[PDB]
């Protein structure tokens, strides 16, 4: 009736080398049996899986209210500049992966 | 796609049947009584072991996978006369819109002193 | 609860007769998706439940084309042109949009005569 797919905000994130580089990921979710996970791009335009909630630098934290997860870079480096989105692997109902999507991260020179 | 034999055990006690297929799909229990009512038991994620269970079979039902032998299991406890019923396992692909699509054979429970 | 009831139990028909079986719902049955996720199952004596129409229309491939599924809100109706003696046995609607998941009772088609 209104929907929406897992919100991963902001669509580009720039920032210094040594930085911490936080990503939000919002997910709507019906039921309690789902996991969600924080991936980046391959050069192959493909998915690497960094981190998940529930679960050493890439770490997703479940805030409050239960819509929004932080997954943060901690001291971001260059080669860490690329393609990032979130999804949301949920059983029931209907057993669906959905993905956010995808945001740059920019982590320029210091 | 290929579950356990039929069972015939007494009154409380508990069976584990088994579903051979697998990392690509959700692995779903239905029970049919000697009404030929259907009910749903609940979901499992191969990959992820994470449940989902209707309310109802929650206590009476308790599902499992091995992923290395690619099999799931159900196991019923405290077992009674009403659990009597064809145990059929099926599957559920990820991202489709539909739901059964093969099913096992069933396994025909009997429980009676 | 999503309970799901179907009108009637016994439809009988001349084979190449038209029946129609409904499946009503307690409530909506409109998934976070915006899709409906119903199903009709037929089950022949004997053997698995198998499907034949999913979302609210889509036949499965497969599946003929004489057995078509329509349907809205709260109100579902499988309907079947030309009826054969493959189509005998008993059609199960289902909805797989709110946990628990939840069967119709239903509806056995016979050959009237």
């Known amino acids: 009736i209104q929907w929406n797919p897992p919100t991963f905000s902001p669509a580009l994130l720039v920032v210094t080398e040594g930085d911490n580089a936080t990503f939000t990921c919002s997910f709507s979710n019906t039921s309690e049996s789902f996991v969600l996970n924080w991936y980046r791009m391959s050069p192959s335009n493909q998915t690497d899986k960094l981190a998940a909630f529930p679960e050493c630098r890439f770490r997703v934290t479940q805030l409050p209210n239960g819509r929004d997860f932080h997954m943060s870079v901690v001291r971001a480096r260059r080669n860490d500049s690329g393609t990032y989105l979130c999804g949301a692997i949920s059983l029931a109902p209907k057993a669906q992966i959905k993905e956010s999507l995808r945001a740059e991260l920019r982590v320029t020179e210091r | 796609l290929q579950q356990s034999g039929p069972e015939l055990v007494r009154p409380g006690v508990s069976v584990k049947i088994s579903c051979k297929g697998?990392?690509?799909?959700?692995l779903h229990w239905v029970r049919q009584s000697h009404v030929k009512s259907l009910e749903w038991i609940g979901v499992?994620?191969?990959?992820?072991?994470?449940?989902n269970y209707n309310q109802r079979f929650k206590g009476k039902a308790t599902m499992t996978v091995d992923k290395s032998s690619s099999t799931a299991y159900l196991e019923l406890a405290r077992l009674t006369s009403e659990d009597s019923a064809i145990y059929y396992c099926?599957?559920?692909?990820?991202?489709?819109?539909?739901?059964?699509?093969?099913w096992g054979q069933g396994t025909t429970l009997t429980v009676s002193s | 609860d999503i309970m799901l009831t179907q009108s009637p139990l016994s439809l009988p028909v001349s084979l190449g007769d038209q029946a129609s079986i409904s499946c009503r719902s307690s409530?909506?049955?409109?998934?976070?998706?915006?899709?409906?996720?119903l199903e009709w199952y037929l089950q022949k004596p004997g053997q698995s439940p198998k499907l034949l129409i999913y979302?609210?229309?889509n036949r499965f491939s497969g599946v003929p084309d004489r057995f078509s599924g329509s349907g809205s809100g709260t109100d579902f109706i499988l309907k079947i042109s030309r009826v054969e003696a493959e189509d005998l046995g008993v059609y199960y609607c289902?909805?797989?949009?709110?946990?628990?998941?939840?069967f119709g009772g239903g509806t056995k088609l016979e050959i009237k005569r």
């Open positions: 099926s599957r559920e692909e990820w991202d489709v819109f539909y739901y059964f699509d093969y």
């Open positions: 697998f990392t690509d799909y959700a």
């Open positions: 499992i994620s191969s990959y992820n072991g994470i449940t």
């Open positions: 409530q909506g049955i409109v998934h976070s998706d915006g899709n409906t996720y």
């Open positions: 979302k609210v229309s």
């Open positions: 289902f909805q797989g949009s709110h946990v628990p998941y939840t």
